Amino acid sequence: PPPVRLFGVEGTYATALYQAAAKNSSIDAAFQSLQKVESTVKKNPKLGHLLLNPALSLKDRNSVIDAIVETHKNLDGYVVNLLKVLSENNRLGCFEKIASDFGVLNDAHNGLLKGTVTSAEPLDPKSFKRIEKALSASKLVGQGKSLKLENVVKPEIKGGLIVELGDKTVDLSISTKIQKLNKVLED
């Protein structure tokens, strides 16, 4: 079964798409074409991203597909069948959802892992690099995998850092420590 499962509808579409292109052994091709069709959809904002509104016909939906494969003739072919499927199931409206989902699945296959270093305010680039080095070095990143570490700004977390990746976290923050500290002196 394809590594990394995607629960629920729209990601069942992604799961299918990946495994279908995995047996064709043309996943990179799929990914590239998916980025391209998503991009030219996204870059056509009014009329063709804001006319993904759910109200179009069966026949009009088919013709939206025909315009999409008119827009560029470079598509994997599995993803040309996928366009048909989403139209046919008339769930075409969620288009980008499947795209994003295929992306999540894909870059897991590629090996890339994503992390997060939430903090109160943005932290140093020196800190970013030191943490990135450490985190990549650690056994947590198995290696043969990469870490796109993203600092995000969350004011709610007061100071510190929280490392997140692999649904495994180490939370050493002042807000979290303060919570536990306060609690212990209210006993």
Partner: protein, 74 residues
């Protein structure tokens, strides 16, 4: 380009406030897609002549309860 033109060709051209196109109807309860300036509990005039108040504003489908017969709204 040609794609954008063909997309423009299939465009609804709905006002999406003050109008909407029926999307299922029967039993008495209809559902229109549109009508995005509808007041809650407003009276909405179906274009075959039925008038119906609208009692549920769902997250995409305004649910208009028909005050007439069903045999006039298609």
């Amino acid at each position: 380009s040609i794609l954008e033109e063909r997309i423009k060709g299939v465009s609804d051209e709905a006002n999406l406030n003050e109008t909407g196109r029926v999307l299922a109807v029967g039993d008495g309860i209809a559902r229109v897609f549109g009508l995005n300036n509808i007041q809650a509990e407003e009276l909405v005039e179906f274009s075959s002549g039925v008038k119906g108040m609208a009692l549920n504003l769902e997250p995409g489908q305004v649910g208009i309860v028909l005050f007439g017969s069903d045999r006039l709204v298609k």
